[PDB]
Amino acid sequence: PLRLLSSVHYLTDGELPQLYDYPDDGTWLRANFISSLDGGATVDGTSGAMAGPGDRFVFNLLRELADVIVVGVGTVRIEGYSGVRMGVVQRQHRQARGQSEVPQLAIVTRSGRLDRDMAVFTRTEMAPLVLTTTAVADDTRQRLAGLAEVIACSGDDPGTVDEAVLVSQLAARGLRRILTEGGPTLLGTFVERDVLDELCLTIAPYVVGGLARRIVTGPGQVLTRMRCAHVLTDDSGYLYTRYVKT
Amino acid sequence: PLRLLSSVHYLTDGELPQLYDYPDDGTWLRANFISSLDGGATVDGTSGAMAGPGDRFVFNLLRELADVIVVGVGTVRIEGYSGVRMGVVQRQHRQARGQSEVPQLAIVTRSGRLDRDMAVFTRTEMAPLVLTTTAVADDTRQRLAGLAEVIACSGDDPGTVDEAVLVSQLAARGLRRILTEGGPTLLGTFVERDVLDELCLTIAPYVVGGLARRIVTGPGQVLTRMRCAHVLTDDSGYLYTRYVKT
């Protein structure tokens, strides 16, 4: 029943985006995370130290493919999120697909407690979206006037974000090709709400010890089956995987 | 820089053990763990629910190849460890390699607080080893007289286990082909002490939510680079990976 995987194909830079194409239509929520062999999402508080050149390339590619990059406010602070950068070629490829030159950032926050002074607001070509709750969207909107478009993402409960609404709120604005880069709380919610369509997961060839949290924190305990779409590798032993529900 | 992995080879039951051969000589500490996509070592408190037929086959194969299966006392209680089972063919293959018919169990405990009444002692063809500290080995030996061989595995500190000594204590008894199936505390220590030579890691195609701990718990924060030896897959989307230091 066991098949050996090995490298069968060098991926030209035209095929690589094909591997990670979004659906032709409909909203697609893709997560991109990196994890150590032993399930560690962080080394020294962030994921950067595991992100080798291979993973950075895939990471930037996924951003390049996305209409919007949805990120929890914690990751935004902790990983020092600034505006998405798109090089001339990235922009070109994006226009070629009928996309804006750079994807937007969508910051998710139930609290609304974002400061006017954050790199996501400051070092950014496009103003980011703030995805938050009906309860606090208005004050958040005013407090962040000029910096971000604040979007109420409550479903039935005006005090929380309904992650399915979040997704539709983005799609409603033509940001249907969604990428989230976390964090683990945010990813946890996408998981619980069963709105995660896709997990792109870099498995870094490291063990990091027990201190690190996983790429998904929270109280959720689901058992969402996903399908292995592909696994890529490089010379450094990284596995760049792509899993799709269900 | 990116190569697509795909199934290039169906593994006959003779090749599969070759993929997981132990070195011809020297002690080798191999860990076998299963993890969800999102780094969850457990579903509902144990790893069983992620272990499909593919993973059970590999798991039993690794046991089959091992001279001894080293397991922390917590995993022994929590996963209801009983004696290792070896079928007639498993035994045959083991004898063919000059190995005993079934590998031994080695239970690791710093405390020594094992009960005479445990399935590891009761439903077992071979009495298991108890790998513990110099400080408590004697009382442990007496309290477990008839049930287990108690082995002092302290290095410089008689109050703790030195995991390198643990490994040598097993090798000294001709149990040099070591497999550990955890748990995460135990694996954490193997990692910190840098004695883990190999991680066989099943990546189950599931996301499980944030509740689960990783396959490595503890305060350790290392960055041990490992080399991807192989990745196998089955029809169910499982990745059966084998990583080797360094």
Ligand SMILES: NC(=O)c1ccc[n+]([C@@H]2O[C@H](COP(=O)([O-])OP(=O)(O)OC[C@H]3O[C@@H](n4cnc5c(N)ncnc54)[C@H](OP(=O)(O)O)[C@@H]3O)[C@@H](O)[C@H]2O)c1
């Ligand atoms: N290995 C990787 O791939 C990876 C990727 C990203 C991050 N990380 C790491 O994980 C760590 C941070 O974890 P984190 O959980 O705090 O990140 P996070 O999910 O980005 O931040 C959590 C916060 O974002 C908001 N949020 C998340 N989900 C929400 C939801 N469904 N509805 C409303 N708000 C939501 C909340 O903000 P409010 O409190 O304002 O309501 C929440 O407190 C960092 O160290 C980071 O480096 C790792």
Ligand SMILES: NC(=O)c1ccc[n+]([C@@H]2O[C@H](COP(=O)([O-])OP(=O)(O)OC[C@H]3O[C@@H](n4cnc5c(N)ncnc54)[C@H](OP(=O)(O)O)[C@@H]3O)[C@@H](O)[C@H]2O)c1
């Ligand atoms: N996904 C997987 O592959 C996998 C595999 C195995 C287990 N698990 C799960 O993880 C959970 C249990 O975790 P756990 O950390 O408690 O398991 P564990 O490592 O087997 O048990 C911990 C205990 O074993 C002893 N121990 C471990 N390392 C030691 C060392 N270096 N020196 C001396 N003693 C040591 C200690 O016993 P004393 O307290 O007596 O000193 C320690 O308290 C279970 O739910 C289990 O299902 C998952």
Ligand SMILES: COc1cc(Cc2cnc(N)nc2N)cc(OC)c1OC
């Ligand atoms: C590619 O650059 C970085 C990317 C990330 C996050 C991240 C990195 N890799 C993957 N596969 N998923 C992610 N969500 C984190 C970083 O450090 C915080 C980075 O800087 C090196």
Ligand SMILES: COc1cc(Cc2cnc(N)nc2N)cc(OC)c1OC
């Ligand atoms: C194969 O049978 C089981 C194995 C395990 C532990 C385990 C399972 N799979 C892997 N890859 N590593 C491990 N350490 C755990 C189990 O449940 C506790 C099992 O029963 C189904």
